[PDB]
Paper text:
[name] catalysis, which plays a vital role in cellular energy homeostasis by catalysing the reversible magnesium-dependent formation of ADP from AMP and ATP10, is dependent on distinct ATP- and AMP-binding subdomains (ATPlid and AMPbd). The turnover rate of [name] is limited by product release, and it has been shown that the microscopic step accountable for this slow release is the re-opening of the substrate-binding subdomains. [name] populates two main structural ground states: an open substrate-free state and a closed Ap5a-bound state. The ground state structures of the [name] and Y171W variants in their apo- and Ap5a-bound states were determined by X-ray crystallography.
The apo and holo structures of both variant enzymes are very similar to that of the wild type with only minor differences in the conformations of their AMPbd and ATPlid domains. That is to say, the apo states are more conformationally heterogeneous. NMR chemical shift perturbation analysis also indicated that the conformations of the apo states differed more than those of the Ap5a-bound states, showing that the apo states exhibit greater structural heterogeneity both in solution and in the crystals. While no similarly pronounced change in the rate constant was observed for the [name] variant, this mutation is significant because subsequent analyses showed that both, this amino-acid replacement and the Y171W variant, redistribute the native energy landscape of [name] (see the section kcat versus kM and kcat versus KD compensation). To assess the accuracy of these measurements, we also determined the diffusion coefficients of the [name] mutant, which were almost identical to those of the wild type.
Numbering used by the authors: 1 to 214
Write the structure that this text describes.
Amino acid sequence: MRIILLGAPGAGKGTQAQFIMEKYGIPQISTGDMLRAAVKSGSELGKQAKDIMDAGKLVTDELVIALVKERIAQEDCRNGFLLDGFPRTIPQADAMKEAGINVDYVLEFDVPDELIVDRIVGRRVHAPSGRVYHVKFNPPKVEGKDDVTGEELTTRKDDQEETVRKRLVEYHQMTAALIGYYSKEAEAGNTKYAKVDGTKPVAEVRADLEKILG
């Protein structure tokens, strides 16, 4: 069972990761994780990808692909894998096909931008301790203040409404053609594609995956 899980930043597609992992007994894999696990290994690619990172240049599509083919070749991927957040472009996806890395399902965790914004800007945090809150779901006992210390709560620079919005616009701009690519690939029978609605409750989204997957 080989699955590609896609979704906008802050949509929360990771909320179904462990379900898929336990359902079909497969590891979760991201380009970020293997970038490190490669350097950790004495692999040539690891040493290669290490130099590119130390020099602060983007990792080439060919090198990332090589790391992927290397990653899924390991024994933990005997029954498949869960590929999280990759590919991100059509060249990358085609490069996976050019190297014969097919997948069974392409899942698109979909959440409207406005909802994502609403979720994120609602966050509050106690920076020095790292304690997190949220105006809904988990508000502090004393309004605007940390339960433990009683100090005023703040917000992350990474959660600024203006910052989050640019991230989404950028993401859609970069992912739009790729979604159509896999949807068309599905019409060609090369893989299966399904646009999952991530606005419903977790338990409901989970049950929808079982009808899509099996």
